[PDB]
Ligand binder design. Structure first.
Ligand SMILES: Cc1nc(N(C)C(=O)Cc2ccc(-c3ccccn3)cc2)sc1S(N)(=O)=O
Lengths: 371, 35, 550, 244
DNA sequence: ATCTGTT
């Protein structure tokens, strides 16, 4: 068919920035295995006609066939970390930043990628080094090289030596420096070799907050298995790409909404336990083999998010309009006005009423047609 | 208080500095011992 | 549970976000942006009598509410969605805000508002308000109010302007942003592609060059003359570096969070000759914004106001009704008077140190607190119940003889006594305001020649095994102890202790923990010395520990 | 005490000085494993009686006499900064000398006379214990006072104290940025205002722990309703947002 | 009557 696109959030035990830079520069002296924590798969649209709610559900459920092994032949994967992109304007600000890109076409590469995505084994640096895409990988680290070069050379450029042949133009120094600098592998490798500390410090500021321990993830997105999988995947990856009406909500709201997505259960032979959170191996194996990461359970969360948000807003808006209209045209004293304000607001949003409303919007099936 | 009895002592003074025409409270004690 | 306690507070914050985002994107005209010549003109003045009339644009958004109503979730969502700068009016407020924000998802360090616009140590001892000013305009325009505010705060403003203009390499223009723009123009790239990466490569640039949305928390304790200064400072900085946002013609947006009822600000002054301290009340920022007519018309406060009601903690009826009556200024009836009669008790009951143990006493003076503390310390000795001891420690102050001579010469009045001057200046030499509530003894002073100094020495009394608080930023050194066995195991199991420290001494923390663990062995047999412990289980433990060690 | 009376693991294991990060991590992991194993063995041996056993471990040898602590030298131990929102306990005072504090005082302060005079006559340090139970030594509090008269600035005085406070009594103005659990108020007739009463009566969550010496609603007081009028008039505006 | 900003 067509290359399937994949976005992979990746992590490693150690210093992720140093290992990534060593991988990029080909200085195979600090590379380490990479663990894939979360991912999402999609196919290019190719058709403007917006499919109905029951068409995209089926199309998406056809991807995660029955074992988390995506259906396809050739794959295009983008490995990324935490951080916020700069220079872009939208409704909200981003939460992740791409790091590099690889293409898997051969049989061996496809088998390795499927094994990594199904069970959870780490990927050795050999495959990543061999399958890297140079033209697209280095289109990202293009302006940073120029900025770092200018900052390093920013020692006073007098450009007035004159003499016999040293009388280069005021603007000629920067022009020549730009011309002689290659915005590719060579420039980055030389800068790393000669100015390692400054380069590392500069890179650690564009990817703020990219080095966290497993307990941080467990505390933020856990402690439940269903939450730990679904909420992580939606909040970090799909929310910005899909860009619906739920892209301006914070993490607490998303967890609250997920609490109502009640679907059948099936206990596992065993769970994860403490004293193993010193590495990403146990958490990765636990997450990749879950039953919420494939099938019809993972193909129908975003639709429920949209439906629930719309259902809540529908009633909230009408109640607010009624209250405001009544408030704006009442002629009474202060005591009566305060009494009315608090009485109306209590009558609308008392605890039992909220409990009933919440019990009225609970689903027991991922299929939109059988909700 | 909740199902109890409250007994208080009050005074009214006729001096110019205190007030007069006004009632003042001195202390409050509980009287619920002999239920 | 915890799902229906956030239902109504998470659907009502969207309009606030929409309005703030709309406000923070409007563009100014080309004939309104302050130029860099205005500050050069100001820096070359001697008295505030030569200031002309000028305007500095800005915009505001108010968030007022009762204490305990839940206005923090708004800041949480704003930080998570928008790009802003979060500050605080004091140190406690900043620490609480950082705790919340970092406990939710993620955050950077949080500082005060004084550190943001360049407040130094010396400015703490300036004289505020010496030159007369009289409003001239019938309902004064914005320029009149701005000039009055700049005249009130003259010393700090002038010093900051001089320092900022001189420190920028004299007349050498800063090259942090200009070189990148020149290179981008030469190479023919998209606008803003290379300049916006300046903060990443330079790690000392101020935060006011990064965003134009400023959040001020607990703004009720700030004086009204600080609404202008901040604004002023912003423009100046952005005119010096020529930042990317200065070229797009944007203006600051100030989001002020507070409560206008249970908060006030005070101003004090010192009068020489008689050596007297005078304190009074003034206006704060929220009242300035709400009450003034010109500001109300300029900032359009009707479309930029959100109000939080409700209280989450009250579970009583009459108490809530009384609180509402007191807050909203309703008339007082006899039912409230009858209700409030349950809490009264004689004063001698309260002032006895043997009644109501562990309760806090609120007075209205610095002398009653001292008297009660002395009474309590005297009582804790003779009528001892154990596990409470009282001891004393010395404190001291050094003076300057030459500087005292100079001050006396400048102020005249040759006849002066060190004791009287020190007694008069008791409220200003110290660092914190609780120095007057301490139980201290008789004063004593001496003169040490050779070094030509005068030293005053005194004693202060403290209790043992009592809870205290640190009113300052002091460095501390950890040197042992971890509690009971279970607590020690729990602390060692999790790595949060490592993460709390900065990302520079992880190896140091590991080494310290390793040393403590190494010294933590032995003494197990002292535990085994418990009477009536065992006979053979001791040998079983011996064998087990030997096998484990092998 | 058997042949392994002193945990002969000591006499057969000598954990020498540390090394590069890898060696430090390996040693730390091995020590954690050993400590956890020995603790598990002992807990299985005895249990609850062992769980609450007293414990104390220090980098060096320390002794306590009355209200004083005698120790050799404070070598090692990571430095840190004390926060103003944390709770501590007053353990005592010590006369041990620390090089870091003295060197910092020499560095930051250019006043050599004060430093020398303090060196001739020393001051004690304060020893505290935090919530979790880690003994800490805290530095002294030094402040500088320079006056400004007319347009001249003169440095005049320096103060040296400890800078700790107790939450057992305070004024009413200070408590406007605090929260309490039990309160006992004390008004004074003659200068009573209603706002002071409102601020003082709202420091606690409930009314079961409140006391006072007079009734402020039956006495004479001053009122000023200017902000309340504006707030009430803003609630009838259809353009103001109200959040429950 | 009266508080808090600065490594
Ligand atoms: C049956 C009922 N329960 C009601 N609750 C829970 C409340 O008022 C809750 C509350 C709301 C605001 C405050 C407050 C406190 C200080 C300053 C301003 N405001 C206190 C408490 S209200 C009603 S009723 N009789 O109006 O319908």
């Amino acid at each position: 068919g067509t290359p399937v696109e994949v976005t992979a959030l990746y992590a490693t035990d150690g210093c992720v920035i140093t290992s990534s830079i060593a991988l990029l520069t080909n200085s195979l002296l600090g590379a380490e295995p990479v663990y894939i924590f979360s991912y999402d798969a999609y196919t290019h649209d190719g058709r403007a006609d917006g499919p109905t709610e029951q068409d995209r559900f089926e199309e998406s459920r056809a991807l995660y066939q029955a074992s988390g092994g995506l259906n396809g032949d050739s794959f295009r994967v983008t490995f990324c970390l935490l951080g916020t992109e700069v220079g872009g304007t939208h409704q909200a600000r981003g939460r992740t930043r791409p790091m590099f890109v690889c293409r898997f076409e051969r049989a061996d590469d496809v088998a390795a990628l499927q094994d990594a995505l199904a069970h959870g084994t780490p990927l050795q640096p050999d495959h990543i080094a061999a399958t890297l895409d140079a033209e697209a990988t280095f289109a990202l680290h293009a302006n940073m090289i120029l900025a770092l070069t200018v900052a390093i050379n920013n020692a006073s450029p007098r450009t007035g030596r004159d003499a016999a042949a040293a009388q280069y133009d005021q603007g000629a120094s920067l022009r020549s420096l730009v011309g002689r600098t290659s915005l590719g592998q060579r420039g980055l490798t030389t800068l790393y070799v000669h100015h390692e500390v400054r380069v590392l410090a500069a890179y650690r500021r564009a990817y703020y907050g990219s080095a966290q321990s497993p307990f941080w993830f467990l505390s933020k997105f856990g402690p439940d298995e269903k939450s730990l999988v679904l909420t992580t995947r939606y909040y970090l990856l799909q929310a910005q790409r899909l860009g619906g009406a739920g892209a301006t909500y914070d993490l607490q709201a998303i967890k609250d909404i997920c609490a109502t997505y009640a679907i059948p259960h099936a206990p596992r032979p065993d769970t994860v336990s403490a004293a193993s959170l010193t590495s990403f191996a146990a958490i990765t194996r636990f997450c990749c083999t879950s039953q919420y990461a494939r099938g019809a359970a993972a193909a129908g969360f975003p639709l429920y998010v949209e439906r629930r948000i719309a259902a809540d807003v529908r009633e909230t808006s009408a109640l607010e309009k009624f209250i405001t209209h009544d408030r704006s045209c009442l002629r009474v004293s202060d005591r009566e006005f305060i009494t009315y304000i608090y009485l109306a607001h209590f009558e609308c949003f008392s605890p039992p009423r909220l409990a009933t409303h919440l019990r009225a919007v609970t689903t027991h099936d991922p299929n939109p047609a059988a909700s | 208080a909740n199902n109890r009895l409250c007994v208080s002592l009050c005074q009214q003074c006729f001096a110019a500095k205190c007030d007069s025409n006004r009632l003042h409270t001195l202390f409050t004690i509980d009287a619920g011992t002999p239920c | 549970a915890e799902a229906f306690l956030n239902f109504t507070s998470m659907h009502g914050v969207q309009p606030i976000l929409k309005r703030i985002r709309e406000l923070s994107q409007q563009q100014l005209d080309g004939a309104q942006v302050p130029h860099l010549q205005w500050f050069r003109d100001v820096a070359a003045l001697e008295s505030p009598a030569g200031l002309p009339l000028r305007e500095f644009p800005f915009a505001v958004y108010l968030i007022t509410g009762n204490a305990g109503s839940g206005k923090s979730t708004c800041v949480q969502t704003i930080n998570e969605v928008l790009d802003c700068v979060v500050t605080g009016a004091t140190r406690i407020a900043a620490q609480n805000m950082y705790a919340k924000l970092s406990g939710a998802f993620l955050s950077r360090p949080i500082n005060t508002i004084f550190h943001e616009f360049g407040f130094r140590g010396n400015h703490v001892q300036a004289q505020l308000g010496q030159y007369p000013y009289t409003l001239t305009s019938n309902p004064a325009s914005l320029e009149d109010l701005q000039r009055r505010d700049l005249t009130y705060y003259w010393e700090v403003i002038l010093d900051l302007t001089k320092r900022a203009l001189a420190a920028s390499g004299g007349e050498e223009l800063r090259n942090e942003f200009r070189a990148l723009a020149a290179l981008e123009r030469t190479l023919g790239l998209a606008e803003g592609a290379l300049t916006r990466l300046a903060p990443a490569t330079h790690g000392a640039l101020p935060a006011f060059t990064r965003s134009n949305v400023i959040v001020i928390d607990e703004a009720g304790l700030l004086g009204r003359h600080l609404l202008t200064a901040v604004v002023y400072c912003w423009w100046m900085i952005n005119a010096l570096y020529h930042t990317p946002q200065y070229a797009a013609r944007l203006r600051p947006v100030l989001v002020c969070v507070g409560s206008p009822t249970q908060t006030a600000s005070l101003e004090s002054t010192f009068e020489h000759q008689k050596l007297r301290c005078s304190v009074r009340q003034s206006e704060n920022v929220l009242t300035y914004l709400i009450c003034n007519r010109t500001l109300r018309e300029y900032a359009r406060l009707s479309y930029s106001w959100a109000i939080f009601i409700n209280n989450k903690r009250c579970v009583e009826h009459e108490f809530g009704n009384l609180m509402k009556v007191l807050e909203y200024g309703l008339p007082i009836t006899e039912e409230h008077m009858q209700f409030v009669d349950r809490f009264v008790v004689p004063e001698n009951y309260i002032t006895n140190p043997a009644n109501l143990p562990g309760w806090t006493r609120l007075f209205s003076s610095h002398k009653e607190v001292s008297a009660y503390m002395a009474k309590l310390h005297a009582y804790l000795k003779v009528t001892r119940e154990g596990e409470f001891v009282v001891f004393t420690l010395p404190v001291l102050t050094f003076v300057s003889v030459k500087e005292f001579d100079e001050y006396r010469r400048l102020t005249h009045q040759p006849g002066l006594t060190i004791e009287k001057w020190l007694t008069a200046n008791a409220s200003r030499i110290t660092n914190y305001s609780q120095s007057q509530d301490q139980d201290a003894g008789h004063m004593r002073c001496e003169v040490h020649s050779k070094q030509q100094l005068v030293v005053a020495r005194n004693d202060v009394t403290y209790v043992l095994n009592s809870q205290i608080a640190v009113t300052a930023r002091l460095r501390k050194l950890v040197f042992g102890f971890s509690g009971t066995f279970r607590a020690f195991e729990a602390v060692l199991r999790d790595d949060s202790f490592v993460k709390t420290q900065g990302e520079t001494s992880v190896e140091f923390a590991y080494r310290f923990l390793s040393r403590l663990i190494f010294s933590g062995l032995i003494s197990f047999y002292n535990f085994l010395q418990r009477p009536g412990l065992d006979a053979t289980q001791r040998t079983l433990a011996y064998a087990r520990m030997g096998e484990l060690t092998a | 005490l058997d042949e392994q009376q002193l945990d002969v693991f000591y006499c057969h294991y000598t954990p020498g000085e540390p090394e590069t990060t890898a060696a430090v991590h390996t040693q730390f992991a091995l020590l954690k494993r050993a400590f956890l194993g020995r603790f598990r063995i002992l807990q299985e041996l005895f249990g609850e009686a062992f769980e609450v056993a007293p414990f104390s471990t220090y980098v060096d040898n320390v002794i306590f006499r009355g209200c004083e602590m005698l120790t050799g030298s404070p070598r090692g131990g990571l430095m840190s900064v004390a926060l103003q929102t944390d709770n501590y306990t007053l353990m005592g005072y010590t006369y041990a000398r620390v090089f870091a504090f003295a060197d910092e005082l020499r560095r930051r302060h250019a006043t050599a006379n004060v430093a020398e005079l303090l060196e001739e006559a020393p001051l004690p340090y304060v020893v505290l214990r935090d919530q979790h139970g880690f003994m800490s030594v805290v530095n002294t509090n030094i402040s500088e006072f320079v006056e400004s008269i007319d347009s001249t600035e003169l440095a005049m005085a320096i103060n040296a104290d400890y800078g700790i406070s107790s939450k057992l009594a305070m004024t009413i103005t200070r408590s406007q940025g605090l929260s309490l659990d039990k309160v006992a108020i004390c008004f004074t007739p003659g200068n009573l205002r209603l706002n002071s009463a409102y601020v003082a009566m709202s420091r606690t969550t409930s009314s079961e722990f409140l006391r006072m010496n007079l009734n402020p609603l039956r006495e004479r007081h001053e009122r000023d309703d200017v902000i309340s009028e504006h707030i009430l008039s803003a609630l009838r505006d259809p353009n103001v947002v109200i959040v429950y």
